[PDB]
């Protein structure tokens, strides 16, 4: 009961930003000027990689506070909608609630968001 | 910087190199023990512990954020969960933090 199950589908469909979901980081990959970090996130039900970290939060990544398997609460995000209809979430503020070290593994068996 | 050295240490653990690295940050775990976030120019990694004997380098500021150093002696230990940690035993600071002034390049976390 640690993650905001269903938050990913809710953001992709509704596009509303008035929630502060708790998510698990699965993987973080840089796009390379400072790098821009793209995140594969889980809400416990689904995974999706349509997340970009605001560059202000790069220190959480670079200092390894935000890393694979950590659990975090998204305090502020923005949604943008691409020409092709894909929603992209820009993570503007977040708090790591439990470190990757403390969580240790992927929570549950999330599947790719598929709707 | 010795680009690729971090990957090499993590993947092979070959003690027989003397890499040139940049210190990105130093954080104490509290008699202090100092853990370092290091960069080889391509990757950063925080799995570096300073041997106690080298504490004066930190406390007198020779070793501080942005300085460039050469590692002369280190060992790699692997933890129970399979993560590797580097213990730094001998090093020399080649350029001070003040002389370098900035992070070199745009290194990303070691992720393999």
């Amino acid at each position: 009961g640690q993650l905001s199950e269903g938050a990913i589908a809710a953001i992709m469909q509704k596009g509303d930003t008035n929630i502060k979901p708790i998510l698990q980081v699965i993987n973080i990959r840089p796009i390379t000027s400072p790098p821009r970090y793209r995140l594969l996130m889980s809400d416990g039900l689904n995974t999706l990689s349509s997340f970009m970290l605001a560059t202000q939060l790069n220190p959480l990544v670079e200092e390894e506070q935000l890393s694979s398997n950590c659990v975090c609460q998204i305090h502020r995000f923005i949604v943008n909608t691409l020409k092709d209809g894909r929603r992209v979430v820009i993570l503007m503020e977040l708090e790591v609630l439990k470190s990757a070290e403390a969580v240790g593994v992927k929570i549950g068996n999330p599947v790719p968001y598929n709707e | 910087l010795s680009e690729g050295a971090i990957a090499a240490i993590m993947q092979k653990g070959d003690t027989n190199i003397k890499p040139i690295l940049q210190v990105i940050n130093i954080r104490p775990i509290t008699p202090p023990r100092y853990r370092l976030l290091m960069s080889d120019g391509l990757n950063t990694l925080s799995s570096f512990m300073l041997a106690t004997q080298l504490n004066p380098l930190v406390e007198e500021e020779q070793l501080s954020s942005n300085c460039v150093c050469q590692i002369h002696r280190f060992i790699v230990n692997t933890l129970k969960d399979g993560r590797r940690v580097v213990i730094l035993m001998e090093l020399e600071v080649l350029k001070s933090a003040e002389a370098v002034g900035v992070k070199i390049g745009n290194p990303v976390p070691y992720n393999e």
């Binding site: 390894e64 070290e101 | 940050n25 954080r27 775990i29 023990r33 853990r35 512990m49 933890l79």
Partner: peptide, 12 residues
């Protein structure tokens, strides 16, 4: 010794 010094994240 090392297990305890590495159980935490680098940055709290």
């Amino acid at each position: 010794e090392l297990e305890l010094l590495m159980e935490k994240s680098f940055w709290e």
